[PDB]
Structure 1
Amino acid sequence: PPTLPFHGESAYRTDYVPKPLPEVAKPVEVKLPPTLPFNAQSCYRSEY
């Protein structure tokens, strides 16, 4: 008589394989608004 060869693979042996790592490369590139150039052009030079 033959031996029924043991096929069997547990939960811990089956149901996860090493996943590919998540592809993350994205910073928050913020274009700076340039400082709005200032003429609240003062009193002395403004009127006299």
Structure 2
Amino acid sequence: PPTLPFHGESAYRTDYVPKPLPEVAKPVEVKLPPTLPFNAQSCYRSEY
């Protein structure tokens, strides 16, 4: 009589094979605006 090969694998083996690592390099920056120059004025030093 003939014999068959072993065709059957474990449920952990068939699914839990390793998985591709995600793309974890997406850095972003901010847009902090510059400060407008000082043009405010004191009333004493503007009048007197």
In structure 2, runs of 5+ residues without a counterpart are none
With normalisation by structure 2, the TM-score equals 0.68
In structure 1, runs of 5+ residues without a counterpart are none
Tell me how large the CA RMSD over aligned residues is.
Answer: 1.7
Count of residue pairs the alignment pairs up: 48
Question: Percent identity of the aligned residues?
Answer: 100
For each residue in 1:1-48, what CA deviation from the matched residue of structure 2 results, as whole angstroms up to 9, or x when unmatched? 011222111111101332221112223300221122222211233222
Distance 2:28 2:5 in 1: 58
